């Protein structure tokens, strides 16, 4: 693929996170609060589809803001 | 002639897409490219050698196409050594089925070369001389040095099929036996006298052209 | 639901021999358990489409295989119908 | 579920004609071996070779092609297909292409070409023309 380097998953697996490892939250998300989709990160489809629900649950925890603009 | 040590020069081809019709010639692909086998290459080249010499035996005539780059400097050398007419560039539309234009082309050449003697240059306004000089230059350049084409030929040699579809199809329209180099990315069955060898290599095309020129020459110098 | 535990338990008494896993008697039994389960949930949830579609497919397959065992053998049909209490 | 094996073999044969490959693979049958043998005996089949593996077949046949790579037949099809089975008497038996082609027909005594079937005055159920 013409996206960034493939097999970014070398540091995670088989399942993650869901909320206990900020070491894979902040890498995969932006600074304003937005999510980084698959194009820039270079990760796979499945890991993206898990991290989606993962942030959905973690913003539930108040461990993470829905949007961080201030 | 062909020998396996001369077959060791040929290696690889262009690999962007490969026709499944010629997997039989393929030996084994490696390093990301397809390579052609050479055991059948020697036999096929020996045969095509024999047919070309037989064409030469009766007093044959053959064409040399070299429109591809990095082939012209070899194609002219081998054809002029061979003693047969030649091309290295533009095949103007129709050269084996449009005979009514080739005769007029060579006739215009025969006409416009000769007026240089009795006064053609400066013997008149700049407008016509500057036109005729560029006309002569472009005609001899993109037509080539061929001016001996008089009797319709009975066999042809080509450098590449993939560039020269239109002429190989015109020859099929004129049911002429066709021989010429065959890349691994060309239609096999459009040509009946095949030679599965590489064409990108300058040395490969040089040696093939040298051998074919010697073949045509050996067959022509004998009683024809 | 069904569960592999109870499935594997009940098939042992209805299997024609120990080593077999086919023997539609096994299949008719597990299908009957399945249809009762799905029918209880479908009475629990009146409206849906996957449930009734499924029930119809399994009932059709059960009838097809039950008719198959009607021509291979003649007592087996009877013993199954009056043991499962099914196919009135 | 496959409705007819003869249809399969004839489609395989014609689809082998359209691309021209000497070898083809197809699950064999007794009628299939017999009709393959008659195909070789007409001259359309270069060679016949049955093989055995679990369970049936698989009948491997070697096609035939002319020197200029010309297909021998110009068409090939069946007549007796399911639903509408067909039969043929001894005198009524058809001469497709006359001598040119032949008419495979199954009889009470076995399957033979069209000729012998009209010679012996015993007809049968036709299967497929060929020409």
């Amino acid at each position: 693929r013409r996206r960034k380097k493939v097999c970014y998953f070398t540091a995670n697996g088989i399942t993650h996170i869901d909320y206990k490892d900020t070491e894979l939250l902040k890498r995969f998300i932006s600074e304003r609060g937005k999510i980084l989709p698959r194009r820039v990160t270079g990760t796979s489809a499945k890991y993206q589809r898990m991290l989606t629900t993962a942030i959905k649950r973690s913003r539930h925890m108040a461990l993470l803001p829905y949007v961080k603009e201030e | 002639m062909k020998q396996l040590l001369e077959a060791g020069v040929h290696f690889g081809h262009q690999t962007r897409r490969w026709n499944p019709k010629m997997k039989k010639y393929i030996f084994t692909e490696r390093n990301g490219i397809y390579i052609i086998d050479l055991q059948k290459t020697v036999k096929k080249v020996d045969e095509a050698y024999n047919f070309l010499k037989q064409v030469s035996e009766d007093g044959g005539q053959v064409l040399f196409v070299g429109t591809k780059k990095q082939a012209q400097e070899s194609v002219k050398s081998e054809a002029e050594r061979a003693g047969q007419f030649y091309i290295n560039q533009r095949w103007l539309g129709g050269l084996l089925t449009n005979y009514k234009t080739i005769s007029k082309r060579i006739k215009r050449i025969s006409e416009i070369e000769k007026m240089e003697e009795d006064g053609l240059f400066e013997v008149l306004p700049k407008k016509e001389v500057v036109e005729l000089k560029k006309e002569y230059d472009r005609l001899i350049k993109f037509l080539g040095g061929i001016r001996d084409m008089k009797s319709m030929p009975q066999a042809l040699f080509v450098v590449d099929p993939r560039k020269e579809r239109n002429a190989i199809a015109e020859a099929r329209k004129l049911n002429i036996p066709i021989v010429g180099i065959v890349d691994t990315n060309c239609d096999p069955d459009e040509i009946d006298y095949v030679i599965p060898a590489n064409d990108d290599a300058i040395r490969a095309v040089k040696l093939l052209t040298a051998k074919m020129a010697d073949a045509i020459l050996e067959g022509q110098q004998g009683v024809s | 639901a069904i569960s592999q535990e109870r499935k594997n338990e009940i098939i042992k008494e209805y299997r024609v021999h120990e080593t077999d896993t086919g023997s539609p008697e096994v299949q008719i039994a597990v299908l009957t358990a399945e249809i009762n389960a799905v029918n209880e949930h479908l009475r629990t949830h009146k409206k849906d489409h996957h449930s009734r579609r499924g029930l119809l497919k399994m009932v059709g397959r059960r009838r097809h295989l039950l008719n198959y065992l009607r021509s291979k053998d003649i007592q087996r049909y009877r013993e199954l119908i009056k043991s499962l209490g099914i196919r009135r | 579920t496959m409705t007819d094996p003869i249809a399969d073999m004839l489609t395989r044969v014609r689809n082998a004609n359209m691309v021209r490959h000497e070898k083809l693979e197809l699950p064999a049958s007794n009628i299939k071996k017999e009709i393959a043998e008659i195909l070789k005996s007409e001259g359309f089949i270069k060679n016949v070779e049955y093989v055995e593996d679990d369970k049936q077949g698989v009948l491997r046949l070697f096609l035939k092609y002319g020197q200029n790579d010309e297909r021998v037949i110009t068409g090939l099809k069946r007549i007796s297909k399911p639903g509408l089975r067909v039969y043929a008497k001894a005198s009524e038996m058809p001469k497709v292409l006359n001598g040119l082609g032949i008419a495979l027909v199954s009889t009470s005594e076995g399957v033979i070409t069209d000729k012998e079937a009209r010679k012996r005055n015993v007809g049968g159920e036709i299967i497929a023309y060929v020409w």
Binding site: - | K173, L174 | - | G43, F44, V72, L97, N98, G99, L100, I102
Partner: protein, 164 residues
């Protein structure tokens, strides 16, 4: 391919149309005409061409006709066997005939068969009635027609065991 003016010949025209090309202002037309060419002894070929006048157009069609040629497998003044022609919905169907019958077919295909030297033959046009498509289908049927010797060489056996 390989036109020859050495044999005897019989020009035969099938149809002529007045065919028009519309441009701004006037309306440009250019006549058309198709022809079939054969020596009525076992060789035939059709032809097409267009010009602004009849004689030049039909001359063009004829000079292009000899360049496409047909071997016409013939036997006993009749086609060897029966066939069906098909080309672009211009279907056609031929069948041999006992001597003394004569070619019966449509005008164009009659001209095609009369000029290919066939005496007695049975046929009927089908599908489309336009001369060009059914004529081309007729010629296509003659291209994929075979005789006893053309097949007996192919099959391992010989003639006199398989014959019309």
């Amino acid at each position: 391919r390989r036109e020859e003016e050495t044999k005897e010949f019989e020009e035969r025209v099938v149809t002529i149309n007045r065919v028009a090309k519309v441009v701004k202002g006037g309306r440009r037309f250019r006549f058309t005409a198709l022809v079939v060419v054969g020596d009525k002894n076992g060789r035939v070929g059709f032809g097409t061409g267009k010009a602004q006048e009849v004689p030049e157009a039909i001359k063009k069609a004829v000079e292009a006709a000899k360049k496409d040629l047909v071997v016409v497998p013939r036997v006993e003044g009749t086609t060897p066997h029966t066939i069906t022609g098909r080309y672009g919905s211009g279907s056609v169907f031929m069948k041999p005939a006992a001597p003394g019958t004569g070619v019966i077919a449509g005008g164009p295909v009659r001209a095609v068969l009369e000029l290919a030297g066939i005496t007695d033959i049975l046929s009927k046009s089908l599908g489309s009635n336009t001369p060009i498509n059914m004529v081309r289908a007729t010629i296509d049927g003659l291209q994929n027609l075979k005789n006893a010797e053309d097949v007996a060489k192919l099959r391992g056996k010989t003639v006199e065991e398989l014959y019309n």
